[PDB]
């Protein structure tokens, strides 16, 4: 769905502020203030390859960066989707205690 019908590669680029509190970064200094993360989806290739300041990396590096930015995708608090909205709709006190 993301890939344009006909085009081989679909590209998203996202730029964030950088601070000297996150490790395992490529090409980017701690004093630098720019983190550029690029995701490309193509039909022919089936692998998890991301880009950090336009440098190819495995998804593990970007995942551990996301972990070190105190932001989480699986957790429902940081990200809310339709299924997650439905799950919050019928929410028990035990789930509140768990969170």
């Amino acid at each position: 769905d993301f890939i344009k019908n006909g085009q081989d590669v679909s590209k998203i680029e996202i730029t964030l502020k950088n601070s000297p509190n996150v490790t395992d970064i490529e090409y980017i200094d701690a004093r630098d203030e720019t983190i550029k993360i690029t995701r490309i989806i193509t039909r022919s290739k089936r692998r998890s390859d991301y880009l950090i300041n336009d440098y190819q990396v495995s998804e593990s590096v970007v995942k551990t960066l996301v972990a070190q930015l105190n932001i989480q995708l699986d957790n429902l608090c940081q990200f809310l989707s339709q299924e997650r909205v439905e799950e919050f709709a019928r929410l028990k006190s035990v789930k509140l205690l768990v969170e």
Binding site: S10, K11, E13, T15, K17, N18, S19
Partner: peptide
Amino acid sequence: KRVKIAKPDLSSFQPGSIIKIRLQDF
């Protein structure tokens, strides 16, 4: 003079925020 877009200076923006997003071939 020639029109210049606002400078995406990340220092002014709060840490962890996003200034410019590029969407290609969607």
